Symmetry: C3
Subunit: 282 residues, 3 copies
C-alpha cells in the first residue's frame, strides 16, 4: 500500500532522539556509497545504530554502515546518516525517505545529500565532484513516488514544485569554497538521473540517458530531495563520479561496486574537506 | 495484486445506476482539474456522490467534486464524472478506470476525456485548448497498466491496438466546430504524455519530455483511454493548457495547483461552450 | 513484496526435475510467441506441463503452450520452455524469472532467449531475425527488477554488470552459421527495448523508442537476461520481427497478436533450422 507512517510515527521517533541526545542539529547530511568517512570529522559525536531507533529502516548495502551520528562539524551542529536506503533493497520510497521527515521535526533546516554516481558527461573524469543542479526522476514518471497517497498537510502541500529544488545560493557558495581550496580540477555541476537498479546499465541505456541530458546516473537521492522540498528543507547535494560508464560495445571492462568504494577512499580527504568547509556557509 | 474487480462487480454497479435514474446516456464525459463547471449546463440533471454508488472509488483532489451527474447537454443524453481519480492518490490503475467499464455496460458508446496540462510545446500559450491526437504512456512502459493481469474477454481482447485511440472523425468535427465559434486563437492539437506525479517536473525532465515529442504533460487520462479503447468505446479528448512549464534554470516562479484551478475558470465559458456545441456531432 | 522464493525453493524444483528425467541438459532455450515449434525437432524428448512441476508459474498467453521439454537437439542435450511468462499477465519479475535459476541448478551453462518483436529500425522487414546485441530495460529504470530485494550470494553478486550481457563469441558464431545457410536476407543485429504491455504502442511512443536507439520493441526477455547474467549463465538471444510498427498518424492498420503468431509459422522452418545448427557451436 501507500505510505504506512502516520505523522505520529515521525513524531515519536523525533521525540526519542531528542530525549537521548543534547545535540540540536540544524544541518542533516546523508552519506552515500564510499562517503561514510565524512563522519570521522565530527566533534562531540554520539552514534545510534538504525536498529535501536524506533521506526527506523536498516541499511543492507556494503559501504553503508547504518548509523545515525550527531556531532559538531566545523562549528555547525549536524546529524549524519552514515549509509542510506535504496529502492533496490526492497524498500518502498516512503520507507527510504523516513529519516528526512524526522529531521524536519528535529528542527533541521538544511539537508545536504551525497552519492556515488556513474559519469555520463564525457568531460567528467573519475574522482570528479559534481554539484547537482537538477535531477530527472525516472521512477517518478511511472508513479513510484514517496508522496503517492493522501497528502499530509502538516508536512507540505499536495502539489509541490521541484524546479527550484537545489538551492541556488548554496551552489554559489560551493563554487567560491572550491576556489579557496586551490584544487586543480574544476567543480563540475549537472543533472543527476535516478533509475531503480540494482544492476548496472547497458551501453544502449547509457547513450539514452546521456541523450536525455543527464550528466550522471545513480540509484538514489531523488526520493529524499522530493520529500525534503515538500516539507520545506533547503537542499544541496553532490555526486562523486566513481566511474566512466561504458558507452561503446567494444567495452574493455565492466562496472562493479568495488571500484565505487575504492574511489570513495581516494576522494575521501578531498570531499570531507569540502563538506567541512561548506559548513561555514549557511 | 492485479485487477480486483470481476465482471460482476462492474455489472452490479451498472444495474444500480440503471435502477436509480431514467437517464440512458450515450456519451460519457470525464472532467479534469478546473473543468468541473461543464456540469452546470446539463438539463434534467441527477447527481450521485461517488460515495453512494456501490463499487465506486473517491476523489480526494481539490478541483474534483467527486459526483456522477446524468443530464441532457445540447440535446444529447450524457453522464459526467465531475472529478476523476489519479494514481498519485494511491489508487491502482484498475481502480482509476473502474467508471469506464461501468459506462460501457450502461450502453455508452463515446467517451470524451478532459484534463489540465502543462504546455511543453513552445507555441502553446496559457489558456490554449489542445486536441489530443496521441499519447505517450510512461507508466505503461514499466508495466503499470490497467489491463495487467488476466484478460476479461467479455470486455475486450488480450492485445488491444492503441495507434488509432483518438477518433479521427471527431477531431475533424472539433476543428470545424471551433471555426464556427469565431475564436481568435487556433485550436491546438498534439501528443499528451502522462507521468505519475504528484510533484511538478524539474527543468531537466521537461526538456527531456519535449525532446521525446510530447506537447503537454499531465498526471492522468491515458489509463482511461486504454480501458476505453479495450472495451470498444470511441474516444476523443483535450487538454486545457494551464501553464507554460519552466524550461530554464533562471526560472522566475514555479508551478502550483492554484494556477491550474484559476486557469480553469478563465477558460470555463470557452471550453464549456465548445463541449456543448460538440454534442451536436456524434 | 520482493522475491518470495528462497534458495531452497529453486533447489527443490531442480531436484524434482533431476529425479524424473535422465536428461542432463547443458543448454536452455526459452521459446517466445509463435516460436513454440522449435520443440518438435528434439529427439528422446520428455515433456512436463508447468502445472506438474512444483514451484512453477503458468503461461496464460496464446502461443505459449506452457510445457518444459527436455531433449536432444542436433547432438546437444537441452531443455526448452515452450512458452514463457510476462509481467502483463500479473506476474512479478521474481516469478517470471524462476525457471532461469532452476536451470542454473540443473547444471545448465548457456541460455538462449527468443521472442517476437515489433521492428523500430526502418531497415527491418517482417520476417527478419535480429540478434540481440544489447537491451534497454525500461521497467528497470523505475525499480521493477527481478533482483530487487536482498541479494542471494549463492547465485550472484549484489551489483552485477550488464554491459557484456550478450555473448560476443556466440554472436560471431550466429553470423558464420547464417552464412552457411545461404539465406537471401542478412542477419540483423540490434538493441531490444522492453516495456510492460499488454497494449500495443502509439505512434508517439514508437518514435520515442526509435529515437532512444532501440531497434525492436517487446514485452519480455530482459528480466530473464538479468537473472541469467547474475547467476553466471552465458546468454545469447534473437527477436523475430513480426511486424513493422506504425510510425505515421495516417496509419492503415493496427498491430494484433494474430499477425504475430502467423509470422511465427512463416519463419518457423527458418529459425528452427537456425537454432538447431547453432547447437553445434558452444
Ligand atoms: O555507474 C553507475 N550506475 C548506477 N549507479 C551507480 C553507478 N556508480 C555508482 N552508482 C551507485 O553506487 C551503488 C553501486 O555501486 C548504487 O547504490 C548506485 O546508486
Ligand atoms: O505542469 C503540469 N505538470 C503535470 N501535471 C500538470 C501540470 N499542469 C496541470 N497538471 C495536472 O493538474 C494537476 C496538478 O495541478 C494534476 O492532477 C496534473 O494531472
Ligand atoms: O509491436 C510489438 N510491440 C510490443 N510487443 C510486441 C510487438 N510485436 C510482438 N510483440 C510481443 O508479442 C506479444 C504480442 O503479440 C507480446 O508478448 C510482445 O512481447
Amino acid at each position: 500500500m501507500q505510505n504506512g507512517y502516520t505523522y505520529e510515527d515521525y513524531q515519536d521517533t523525533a521525540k526519542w532522539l531528542l530525549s537521548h541526545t543534547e545535540q540540536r542539529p540544524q544541518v542533516a547530511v546523508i552519506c552515500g556509497s564510499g562517503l561514510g568517512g565524512l563522519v570521522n570529522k565530527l566533534t562531540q559525536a554520539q552514534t545510534f545504530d538504525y536498529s535501536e531507533i524506533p521506526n527506523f529502516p536498516e541499511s543492507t548495502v556494503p559501504g553503508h554502515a547504518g548509523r545515525l551520528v550527531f556531532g559538531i562539524l566545523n562549528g555547525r551542529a549536524c546529524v549524519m546518516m552514515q549509509g542510506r536506503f535504496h529502492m533496490y533493497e526492497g524498500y518502498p520510497f516512503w520507507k527510504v525517505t523516513f529519516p528526512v521527515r524526522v529531521f524536519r521535526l528535529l528542527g533541521v533546516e538544511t539537508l545536504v545529500v551525497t552519492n556515488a554516481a556513474g559519469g555520463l558527461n564525457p568531460n567528467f573524469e573519475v574522482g570528479d565532484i559534481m554539484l547537482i543542479r537538477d535531477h530527472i526522476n525516472l521512477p517518478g514518471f511511472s508513479g513510484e513516488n514517496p508522496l503517492r497517497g493522501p497528502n499530509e498537510e502538516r508536512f507540505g502541500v499536495r502539489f509541490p514544485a521541484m524546479s527550484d529544488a537545489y538551492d541556488r545560493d548554496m551552489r554559489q557558495k560551493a563554487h567560491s569554497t572550491w576556489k579557496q581550496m586551490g584544487e586543480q580540477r574544476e567543480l563540475q555541476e549537472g543533472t543527476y538521473v535516478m533509475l531503480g537498479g540494482p544492476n548496472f546499465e547497458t551501453v544502449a541505456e547509457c547513450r539514452l540517458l546521456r541523450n536525455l541530458g543527464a550528466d550522471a546516473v545513480g540509484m538514489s537521492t531523488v526520493p529524499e530531495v522530493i520529500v525534503a522540498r515538500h516539507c520545506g528543507l533547503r537542499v544541496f547535494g553532490f555526486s562523486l563520479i566513481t566511474n566512466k560508464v561504458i558507452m561503446d560495445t567494444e567495452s574493455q571492462g565492466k562496472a562493479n561496486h568495488e571500484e565505487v568504494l575504492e574511489a570513495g577512499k581516494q576522494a575521501a580527504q578531498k570531499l570531507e574537506q569540502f563538506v567541512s568547509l561548506l559548513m561555514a556557509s549557511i
